[PDB]
Point group: C3
Chain length 201, copies 3
């Protein structure tokens, strides 16, 4: 009701069957289908495919296929990135991942949400809001990060949580919905798992 890409940028409802958006996705799903079917030994092909797939990729990135996204060109990753099986990034808009981020299996990231009232989405209306994942963050298995969310630096996201609100840095958050359960302190510098202490050398 004004150019479509102009509304995406302002957070207004839109649809994406025009302005070359439908082809930007085809170019994208085409590079993804090549990465998902690539033989595990095709390490070079893979290492280079992920450079083409994402808009920005820092050095030392590794993504265990398969990966799924809408357009790959809206995803910006930092250094030493590591993602496990089935990462899904619905990136109809900006998705920014910081340095040293670790992603567990089956994680879903989405900047897109639809209007709750069935009347506002008769034609698949949608809204998009940037997701920002800070540095040295660890997202557990089966996590879901919602639109417009920001995970503060160094934080950890419990497996299975649905993140719907900004998450502050240096905390351990979890739950449905996701809540900060505690702050990461010095006790965590010694106790890495349950009752096991890192008898440092």
């Amino acid at each position: 009701n004004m150019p479509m890409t102009e509304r995406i940028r302002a957070g207004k409802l839109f649809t994406d069957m025009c302005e070359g958006l439908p082809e930007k996705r085809l170019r994208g799903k085409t590079l993804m289908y090549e990465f998902n079917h690539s033989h595990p030994s095709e390490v070079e092909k893979r290492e280079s495919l992920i450079k083409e797939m994402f808009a920005t990729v820092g050095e030392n990135a590794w993504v265990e296929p398969p990966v799924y996204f809408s357009y790959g060109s809206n995803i910006h990753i930092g250094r030493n990135f590591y993602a496990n099986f089935n990462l899904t990034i619905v990136d109809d808009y900006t998705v920014t991942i910081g340095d040293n981020v670790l992603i567990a299996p089956n994680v879903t990231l989405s900047v897109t949400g639809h209007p709750v009232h069935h009347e506002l989405r008769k034609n698949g209306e949608m809204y998009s809001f940037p997701i920002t994942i800070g540095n040295n963050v660890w997202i557990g298995s089966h996590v879901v990060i919602n639109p417009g969310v920001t995970i503060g630096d160094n934080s950890v996201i419990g497996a299975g949580s649905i993140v719907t609100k900004d998450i502050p840095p240096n905390v351990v958050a979890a739950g449905v919905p996701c809540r900060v359960i505690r702050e990461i302190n010095d006790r965590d510098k010694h106790y890495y798992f349950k009752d096991y202490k890192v008898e440092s050398s």
Copy 2:
């Protein structure tokens, strides 16, 4: 016990290694393997493949691969259906989806379940109860819909919820387990997301 398929229709426990069921499952996993490995540019092949896979398909359906099901023939879908990545439907029995239904990535629908008592499932005994999804329904990411569940028209299922009980129409529901959190009213006709209003034209 009486014809296995007869038992399926009655809601009795049963095993599916007979009466041609194992081959009906082969015919379907065959079509599904062709859909999931199809190249993104094979638009015509996909469109016609989804007409073959499911029992009934309304016009304007679109399923983003991959898709996973037991048999394809027990799934009935209405108009303008849209499913995102990895939709899984365990349809050992009828699964019915209405019109204008929207499915987020990684959703699981299952008519089938097993008896909790280990002595009752020694031989993979199971039960199947039809799932009915009303018109204009939006199911969020990572949701799981259990057997016999009925989602009412215009309702919205929040990401990550586990639906074990019917959801009335016109509501926003969520949680583990799912519960109605509020009714969708006219405020949702103006405010589509958080604090952003549809300054309607």
Copy 3:
């Protein structure tokens, strides 16, 4: 530090880019890639592939592709095993599954975890603790079993739960996080689902 494999067996922090671990993973993803890309009709190639993939496999095993794992060799499985779509086992160390175990679609098992304090994982430091799954257990859809977890015999794990603590045998557990909701008694020997009783013949 100490030989890396020696640390794994001890429950000490480690990394896995040495001692031939990277190649044990390649031999693994290769067999896996073959299994996930096989035609639903290549029943024999599949049957024989799972015997190659996993360390130990009992008779009458079935795994609906796709399956995902770190190394195949660390997973041991009993008799009559059944895993639906997208089972994921992050077995950087041992994973033992008993007899007659049934697994729903989209289940994630991980023996590995990372230190909570970002300073302890600069180089992808990780820890591994075996996961033991008792006999005649039934795991629901979208379940995540964390490191060092033991599921007791004859137990049931509701769909969508995040298991972080051992589960006693003969119970029905569920939730985020998981919790014993009740013990499985003789009532379950009669009522298999909600209000449907097995009118025993």
